[PDB]
C-alpha cells in the first residue's frame, strides 16, 4: 500500500529541474500514486498504492511501471486512476506502448505530470503526444502544487519546504504554453 523510498533533496532538484531545453532524455525516477473507485460513482477516491519505479538498462521507467502494474492488477470490476511524476514527457516508443496499454486496460486512466517536455519541436512527437492525451491519458506540466505534493510525499524533506530555483516560474510558463499548443486540436 506504500512502498515509497524517499529520495534526497538534491536528487529531487536534479531529476525534476525544469529548464525547457531541447533534448531526448528519459526519466530515471517515476513516482506514482494509484487510486481505486469502481463503477465509477461520483466523489473520489480511496488510495491503494503509492511508490516509484526506476529505469533499467534496457527498459524505460514507463515500461517498468506497466510491468509492475500488470503483475499486480486484479479487480476488472473497479476503475483505476494512476498519477505519475516524471522528469520528461515520454518517448515516442513509450507513447505508442502506453496507447497500447490504455487500449488493453480501458478501466485505467493515467495522468502524466512532467517537469519538462521531451524534444518539443519535432512535429511527429507533438502530434503523437496530442493523440495520447485524447487516448485515455492526461498530460500536464508539473506546477507549484505538484512540486509541493512531490516534495511532501517522495522526498526526504526533513521539514524544509521546497525552494524553487532561478527562473522556476518562467520555465514553467513556457512549458505550459507550449504543451497547451501541442494538445490544442
Q: Which is nearer to Zn ion, 60 or 141 (CB)?
A: 60
Nearest to 27 by CA among 117, 138, 96: 117
- Which segment (42-50, 91-99, 152-160, 170-178) binds Zn ion by CB under 5 A? 91-99
Q: Which is nearer to Zn ion, 30 or 34 (CB)?
A: 30
64 among annotated binding-site residues: no
Contact of 124 with 105, CB cutoff 8 Å: no
105 among annotated binding-site residues: no
Per CB under 5 A, contacts with Zn ion among 10-69 are: 60, 63
- Which segment (70-78, 93-101, 115-123, 128-136) binds Zn ion by CB under 5 A? 93-101
Contact of 44 with 80, CB cutoff 8 Å: no
Q: Which of 53, 66, 94, 132 binds Zn ion (CB under 5 A)?
A: 94
DSSP string across 35-91: E---SPPSS---EEEEEEEE-BTTB-HHHHHHHHHHHH---TTS-EEEEEEEEE---
Please give the Cα distance from 65 to 88 (Å, whole number).
15
Q: Which is nearer to Zn ion, 100 or 169 (CB)?
A: 100
Per CB under 5 A, does 91 bind Zn ion? yes
91 among annotated binding-site residues: yes
Please give the Cα distance from 14 to 131 (Å, whole number).
30
Q: Which is nearer to Zn ion, 22 or 44 (CB)?
A: 22
Per CB under 5 A, contacts with Zn ion among 122-141 are: none
Residues that contact Zn ion, how many (by CB under 5 A): 5
Q: Which residue is nearest to Zn ion (CB)?
A: 91
- Kindly state the greatest CA–CA separation across the chain: 47
In the complex, the residues that contact Zn ion under the rule CB under 5 A are 60, 63, 90-91, 94
Amino acid at each position: 500500500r506504500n512502498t515509497v523510498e524517499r529520495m534526497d533533496r538534491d536528487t529531487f532538484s536534479y531529476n525534476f529541474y525544469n529548464e525547457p531545453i531541447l533534448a531526448r532524455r528519459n526519466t530515471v525516477w517515476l513516482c506514482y500514486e494509484v487510486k481505486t473507485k469502481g463503477p465509477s460513482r461520483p466523489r473520489l477516491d480511496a488510495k491503494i498504492f503509492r511508490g516509484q519505479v526506476y529505469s533499467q538498462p534496457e527498459h524505460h521507467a514507463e515500461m517498468c511501471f506497466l510491468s509492475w502494474f500488470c503483475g499486480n492488477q486484479l479487480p476488472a470490476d473497479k476503475c483505476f486512476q494512476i498519477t505519475w511524476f516524471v522528469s520528461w514527457t515520454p518517448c515516442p516508443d513509450c507513447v505508442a506502448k502506453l496507447a497500447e496499454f490504455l487500449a488493453e486496460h480501458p478501466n485505467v486512466t493515467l495522468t502524466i505530470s512532467a517537469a519538462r517536455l521531451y524534444y518539443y519541436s519535432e512535429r511527429d512527437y507533438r502530434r503523437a503526444l496530442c493523440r495520447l492525451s485524447q487516448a485515455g491519458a492526461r498530460v500536464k506540466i508539473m506546477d507549484d502544487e505538484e512540486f509541493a505534493y512531490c516534495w511532501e510525499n517522495f522526498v526526504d524533506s526533513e521539514g524544509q519546504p521546497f525552494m524553487p530555483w532561478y527562473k522556476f516560474d518562467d520555465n514553467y510558463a513556457f512549458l505550459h504554453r507550449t504543451l497547451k499548443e501541442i494538445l490544442r486540436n
